[PDB]
Amino acid sequence: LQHHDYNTYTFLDLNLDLSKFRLPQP
Amino acid sequence: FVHRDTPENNPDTPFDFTPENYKRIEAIVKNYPEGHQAAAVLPVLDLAQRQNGWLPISAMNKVAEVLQVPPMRVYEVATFYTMYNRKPVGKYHIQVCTTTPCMLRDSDSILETLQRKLGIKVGETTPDKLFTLIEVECLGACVNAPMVQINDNYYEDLTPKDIEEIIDELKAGKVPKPGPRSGRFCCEPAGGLTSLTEPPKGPGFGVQAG
Amino acid sequence: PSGEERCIACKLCEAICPAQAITIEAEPRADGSRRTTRYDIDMTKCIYCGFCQEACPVDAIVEGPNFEFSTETHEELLYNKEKLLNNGDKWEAEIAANIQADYLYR
Amino acid sequence: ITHTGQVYDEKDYRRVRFVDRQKEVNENFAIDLIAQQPVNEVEHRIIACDGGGGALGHPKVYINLDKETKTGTCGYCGLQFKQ
Amino acid sequence: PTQYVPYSTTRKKIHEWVPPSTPY
Amino acid sequence: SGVNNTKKWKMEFDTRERWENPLMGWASTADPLSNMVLTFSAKEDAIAFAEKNGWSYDVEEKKVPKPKSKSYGANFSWNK
Amino acid sequence: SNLIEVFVDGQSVMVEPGTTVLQACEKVGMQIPRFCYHERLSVAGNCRMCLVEIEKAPKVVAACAMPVMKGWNILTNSEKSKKAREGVMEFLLANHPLDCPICDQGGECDLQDQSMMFGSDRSRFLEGKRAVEDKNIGPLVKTIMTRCIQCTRCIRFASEIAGVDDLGTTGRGNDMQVGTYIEKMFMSELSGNVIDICPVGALTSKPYAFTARPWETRKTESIDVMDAVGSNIVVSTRTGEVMRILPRMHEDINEEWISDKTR
Amino acid sequence: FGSLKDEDRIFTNLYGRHDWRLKGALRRGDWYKTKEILLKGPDWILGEMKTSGLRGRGGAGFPTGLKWSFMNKPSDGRPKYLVVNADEGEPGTCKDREIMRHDPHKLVEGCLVGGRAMGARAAYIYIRGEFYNEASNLQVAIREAYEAGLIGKNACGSDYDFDVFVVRGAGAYICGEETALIESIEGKQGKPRLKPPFPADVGVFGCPTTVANVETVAVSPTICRRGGTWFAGFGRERNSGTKLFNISGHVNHPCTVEEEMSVPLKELIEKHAGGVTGGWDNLLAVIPGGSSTPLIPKSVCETVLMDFDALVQAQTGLGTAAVIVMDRSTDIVKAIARLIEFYKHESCGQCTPCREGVDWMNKVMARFVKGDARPAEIDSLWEISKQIEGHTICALGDGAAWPVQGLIRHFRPELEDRMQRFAQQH
Numbered sequence A: 001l002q003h004h005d006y007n008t009y010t011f012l013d014l015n016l017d018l019s020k021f022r023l024p025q026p
Numbered sequence B: 001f002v003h004r005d006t007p008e009n010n011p012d013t014p015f016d017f018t019p020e021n022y023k024r025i026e027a028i029v030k031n032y033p034e035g036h037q038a039a040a041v042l043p044v045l046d047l048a049q050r051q052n053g054w055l056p057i058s059a060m061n062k063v064a065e066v067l068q069v070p071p072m073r074v075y076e077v078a079t080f081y082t083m084y085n086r087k088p089v090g091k092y093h094i095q096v097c098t099t100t101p102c103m104l105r106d107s108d109s110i111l112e113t114l115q116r117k118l119g120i121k122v123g124e125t126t127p128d129k130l131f132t133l134i135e136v137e138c139l140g141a142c143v144n145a146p147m148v149q150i151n152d153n154y155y156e157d158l159t160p161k162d163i164e165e166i167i168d169e170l171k172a173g174k175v176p177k178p179g180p181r182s183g184r185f186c187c188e189p190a191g192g193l194t195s196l197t198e199p200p201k202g203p204g205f206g207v208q209a210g
Numbered sequence C: 001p002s003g004e005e006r007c008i009a010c011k012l013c014e015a016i017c018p019a020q021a022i023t024i025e026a027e028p029r030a031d032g033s034r035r036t037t038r039y040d041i042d043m044t045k046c047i048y049c050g051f052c053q054e055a056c057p058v059d060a061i062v063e064g065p066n067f068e069f070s071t072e073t074h075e076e077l078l079y080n081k082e083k084l085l086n087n088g089d090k091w092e093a094e095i096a097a098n099i100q101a102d103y104l105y106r
Numbered sequence D: 001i002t003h004t005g006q007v008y009d010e011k012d013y014r015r016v017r018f019v020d021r022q023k024e025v026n027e028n029f030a031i032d033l034i035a036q037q038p039v040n041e042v043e044h045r046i047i048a049c050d051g052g053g054g055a056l057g058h059p060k061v062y063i064n065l066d067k068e069t070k071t072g073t074c075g076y077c078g079l080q081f082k083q
Numbered sequence E: 001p002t003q004y005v006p007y008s009t010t011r012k013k014i015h016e017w018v019p020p021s022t023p024y
Numbered sequence F: 001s002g003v004n005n006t007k008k009w010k011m012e013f014d015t016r017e018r019w020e021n022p023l024m025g026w027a028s029t030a031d032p033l034s035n036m037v038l039t040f041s042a043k044e045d046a047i048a049f050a051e052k053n054g055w056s057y058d059v060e061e062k063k064v065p066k067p068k069s070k071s072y073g074a075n076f077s078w079n080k
Numbered sequence G: 001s002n003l004i005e006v007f008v009d010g011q012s013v014m015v016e017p018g019t020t021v022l023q024a025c026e027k028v029g030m031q032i033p034r035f036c037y038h039e040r041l042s043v044a045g046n047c048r049m050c051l052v053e054i055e056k057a058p059k060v061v062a063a064c065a066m067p068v069m070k071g072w073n074i075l076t077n078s079e080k081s082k083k084a085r086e087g088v089m090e091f092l093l094a095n096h097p098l099d100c101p102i103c104d105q106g107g108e109c110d111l112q113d114q115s116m117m118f119g120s121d122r123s124r125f126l127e128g129k130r131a132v133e134d135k136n137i138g139p140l141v142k143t144i145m146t147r148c149i150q151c152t153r154c155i156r157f158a159s160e161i162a163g164v165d166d167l168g169t170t171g172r173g174n175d176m177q178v179g180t181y182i183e184k185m186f187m188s189e190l191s192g193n194v195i196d197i198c199p200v201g202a203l204t205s206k207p208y209a210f211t212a213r214p215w216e217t218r219k220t221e222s223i224d225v226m227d228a229v230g231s232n233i234v235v236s237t238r239t240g241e242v243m244r245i246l247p248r249m250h251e252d253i254n255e256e257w258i259s260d261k262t263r
Numbered sequence H: 001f002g003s004l005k006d007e008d009r010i011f012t013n014l015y016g017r018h019d020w021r022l023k024g025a026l027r028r029g030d031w032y033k034t035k036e037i038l039l040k041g042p043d044w045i046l047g048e049m050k051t052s053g054l055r056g057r058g059g060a061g062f063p064t065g066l067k068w069s070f071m072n073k074p075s076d077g078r079p080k081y082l083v084v085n086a087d088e089g090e091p092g093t094c095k096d097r098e099i100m101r102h103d104p105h106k107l108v109e110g111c112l113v114g115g116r117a118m119g120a121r122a123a124y125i126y127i128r129g130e131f132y133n134e135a136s137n138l139q140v141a142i143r144e145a146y147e148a149g150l151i152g153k154n155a156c157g158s159d160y161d162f163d164v165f166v167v168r169g170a171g172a173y174i175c176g177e178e179t180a181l182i183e184s185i186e187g188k189q190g191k192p193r194l195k196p197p198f199p200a201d202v203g204v205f206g207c208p209t210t211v212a213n214v215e216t217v218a219v220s221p222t223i224c225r226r227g228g229t230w231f232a233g234f235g236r237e238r239n240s241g242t243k244l245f246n247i248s249g250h251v252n253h254p255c256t257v258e259e260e261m262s263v264p265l266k267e268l269i270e271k272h273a274g275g276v277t278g279g280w281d282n283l284l285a286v287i288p289g290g291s292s293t294p295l296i297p298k299s300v301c302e303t304v305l306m307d308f309d310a311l312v313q314a315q316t317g318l319g320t321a322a323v324i325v326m327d328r329s330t331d332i333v334k335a336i337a338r339l340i341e342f343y344k345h346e347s348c349g350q351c352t353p354c355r356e357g358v359d360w361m362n363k364v365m366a367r368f369v370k371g372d373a374r375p376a377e378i379d380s381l382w383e384i385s386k387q388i389e390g391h392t393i394c395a396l397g398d399g400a401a402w403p404v405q406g407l408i409r410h411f412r413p414e415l416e417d418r419m420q421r422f423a424q425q426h
């Protein structure tokens, strides 16, 4: 039930976590 | 669409991203292309909304400041989208889908029930500031038509009573099992899974040659 | 009826007058509304065509019933806003009845 | 004196005209007459203003009495409307 | 049912500088 | 933004006295050739009218808007 | 080289590649009825009052926008491009407040003319009209913006010709109002040009509010002396006192714009 | 003839039933030939879709291969980009909500499979902000994939580099539009641009860009895996492939089934989903592609089937293939009336014909439901409808006109009676 519970910052904070993976900028 | 400065809603209300928020703000900036920050106004404006639902004129000015854009540029973005609220928002902020698909499947039905339960007109916050009801448009998830999004909860396939039950859950306690409160899973033919009742083929199944 | 003069100085009564009779100059009244500082119909110039009656959007300028206004001096015939407004107040009851009778036709 | 207070003056060379003949001025000046008009209260956000009587009024305009801060005033009648 | 005098009503168009009454 | 009144050449006589009238305040003019503006299709023909009628003339060259390059795609350029 | 040949009603005009369909009509001499397109302002396509019909094409094209291509004959007076104007003018007028005898852009309206030449004899909008709330943009421009046809030339000028970047669109739907979100006056030189550039009389000049009406104004072409750019200007005089000074175009000196001081 | 086999059904994880997460995805074997495909070449990938002849899975129908082919032209020094619009504002498009929520990965490899086809530097996925929970699911999935190294520089153990991003929508149906998705991505107001500077030519941030319905991006990896032919066979002529069909409103079991395209309309409610609530004769009308497409009345429906060619013959659009059904128990005049209310609360207002026109039809439509308006007004709305259809900057004005046109086209007698009903009681 992951869908069943997430925080208001899930999308943003998860993304920040992904920032490291994010390939270099243009 | 005019912000007549009011003691409550005006820049005297100071706004600043929490040390934690500011962190988030940049995460947004680099997700967008380098040399491009303006593109992040919306995502940022959203975190100002995450910080505070009211998002007053002071908050938009800060957004423009952090994002170094013409302030109006932020004002235009906030006004265009319904997601942003330029006025105080109820803690729960329920929104009822009333497009034809939901109406055909009774969406209107739900409304009358919720107005009575919240004991308030549609469009304003309860005196308790507990809930705010608004007649929003198609919120997606039509297969499940009766529907009422509450801060993303997106409850679905709800019969009038169900909501009253949900509202009570919200009124006392929290996290009232958000989702379609009917036997069906996500979207599934109520009968079953005609589409695929067999087991899914595994990796490299019938992968074409070449 | 309230007491606010109908003319709002659009000045097309001046535009369509065939004889150049009506002279209008205007400025925003303190109220902020638009009114004519000077409205002068030169009746000796006027040929009583009745187009001004036609042209006015608010129908402020009307052809009144009275035909007996012969005057000893030429200057009396030139009419400023105060004479016409006074003429309007005197004959308003009949003017209203006359416009009442003919407006469906127009 | 008059609406826009025309005052041929004590030194003008035109005030000569009224000598032995009165001037045309107006009582019930309009400037104050609509100010004397009550504010038409309304329920709707926007309201019309035929001027009263349709064809016998002014080209109909819709006024936005949306802010109690200001009573909309039809540019034609000078009638203030109180939301 | 049961002598006028014509005049211009407009203001002075071009106001005129008044000389300083203070002598110098 | 209409340009149908910038097509034909016109020659206009010099402006003259417009004193206020004492009795009614109407503008009064002593110059007969004031309101007269004759319209001529080409610069050459208008110059001819001045020469044979003996009025002095000072022709002003037509100035037409310069071609301007526009393209909806160009402003979408974040670069510039 | 670089000279396509496009036909405007079969006139084989030749234009540099990259000229808009509206521009192609101009060199032949035809005028596309236009709102929201100003020569020295970016193309926006908001009004779409300029829809024309390139030959052998399913839909009509936006003149100000389509770069004319090779051998596309423009049909500016077709039976279609007139229903594409008879039906747009239906819309601009539908939400318009008819206070033309208040609108001091009475004879200076690019919206009555185009209605009066290219639009429709009568109205079918039996429904109700909308109203916006007049605000303060300053002491020079009177914005009776219930007049606005949302043509976004102000928002352009206020950003492109002058660098104010303040005026902006607010909201969506039929209550998009193009006014400053917070009431901050539009204080800048070059400010008064908005008056001249708004074809509607929504925002017009407050000093010259109701002193005159354009047919009367005798127009004498003269030179700006307030500043040393010597901007060309037209002094509009009625019965012998100047009523307004508005710009007249000089490519090199003031190209259609004049300062707040000299008007 | 539909009845696609479960095996052929591309989106197996539909309805979930299999871990939407990577380990479920590996059992799905979604990342099976990704390295090979990219290795084959970008030209090989577009050959696969050209052979597939796939049509746009979003409301507009265009050959998918040709659209991708357009920005396959050599780079001019600006990074090419991929934009995936997960926004689906159209009513009845819960179609996409599934792939995103249930099978996020399929779309992730759809993105890189598609990316090398257009040589995109990176892909931005605009999921509607309404779906916050949905977003939570995809970036968890995107995070898994990079951790694996499936995406990122040297993605899938290959020379090619790709980065996938998710962008927050803000409750706008118009954001969905191709030129307007971009502007929202750009951060300006969501107002469409004109087509003359085409999306490939002027991209987001002035860099060539391409926009695909999430379904379109998702099927590209499986179509390359199964080959264009396999996919090509299921379709009908130009029409081809299985497209998810959502049936909502007045049906016994409303559900989204990815059954085959070219399905008799009578068959999909009768055989899958749920037979029309109240009986197949209790069908006042069918909305095949969602609100934008014109509704078709019952006599036309079973005769016609769900494929874009057949529908355009029928004067209606396959669109998002969202089937909305209206029993004889509904006031259509009010049903379509709320869709016009759906469009007045939503059109951007950038263009004159949509701004005033859609509001004008809304006012007339509300009077029509009451019956206050006279019978002559009904063809008046016809004429207002086509003024807005061909003059609008984007397609939404195209879309607003069609339901109005459908109501007048097949239900003109009913509206006249509502006209008559009010006149009688005075």
Ligand SMILES: Cc1cc2nc3c(=O)[nH]c(=O)nc-3n(C[C@H](O)[C@H](O)[C@H](O)COP(=O)(O)O)c2cc1C
Residues within 6 Å of the ligand: H055, H056, H057, H058, H059, H060, H061, H062, H067, H085, H086, H087, H088, H089, H090, H173, H174, H175, H176, H177, H178, H179, H211, H212, H213, H214, H216, H217, H394, H395, H396
């Ligand atoms: C008003 C409007 C709303 C739209 N909304 C969506 C949407 O929510 N999702 C979507 O995929 N396409 C939407 N479209 C179509 C897109 O602009 C674009 O054509 C389509 O997404 C391309 O997908 P495809 O080419 O892969 O089919 C919309 C178009 C218009 C005019």
Ligand code: SF4
Residues within 6 Å of the ligand: C006, C007, C008, C009, C010, C011, C012, C013, C014, C024, C055, C056, C057, C058, C059, C060, C061, G101
């Ligand atoms: S009289 Fe009628 S027309 Fe002449 S100005 Fe006053 S209002 Fe306009």
Ligand code: SF4
Residues within 6 Å of the ligand: G096, G097, G098, G099, G100, G101, G103, G104, G105, G106, G109, G110, G111, G112, G147, G199, G200, G201, G202
């Ligand atoms: S703008 Fe002023 S003048 Fe032009 S039409 Fe609207 S109101 Fe009449």
Ligand code: SF4
Residues within 6 Å of the ligand: G147, G148, G149, G150, G151, G152, G153, G154, G155, G178, G197, G198, G199, G200, G202, G203
């Ligand atoms: S104000 Fe004048 S210019 Fe600015 S939008 Fe409204 S009309 Fe176009």
Ligand code: SF4
Residues within 6 Å of the ligand: H174, H191, H192, H347, H348, H349, H350, H351, H352, H354, H355, H392, H393, H394, H395, H396, H397
């Ligand atoms: S049609 Fe005109 S108004 Fe409606 S959305 Fe597309 S652009 Fe904005």
Ligand code: FES
Residues within 6 Å of the ligand: B097, B098, B099, B100, B101, B102, B137, B138, B139, B140, B141, B142, B143, B145, B147, H090, H091, H092, H093
């Ligand atoms: S209309 Fe209610 S979710 Fe589609």
Ligand code: FES
Residues within 6 Å of the ligand: G033, G034, G035, G036, G037, G044, G045, G046, G047, G048, G049, G050, G051, G062, G063, G064, G065
């Ligand atoms: S004039 Fe054609 S787009 Fe505005």
Ligand SMILES: [Zn+2]
Residues within 6 Å of the ligand: D049, D050, D051, D058, D074, D075, D076, D077, D078, D079
């Ligand atoms: Zn009035």
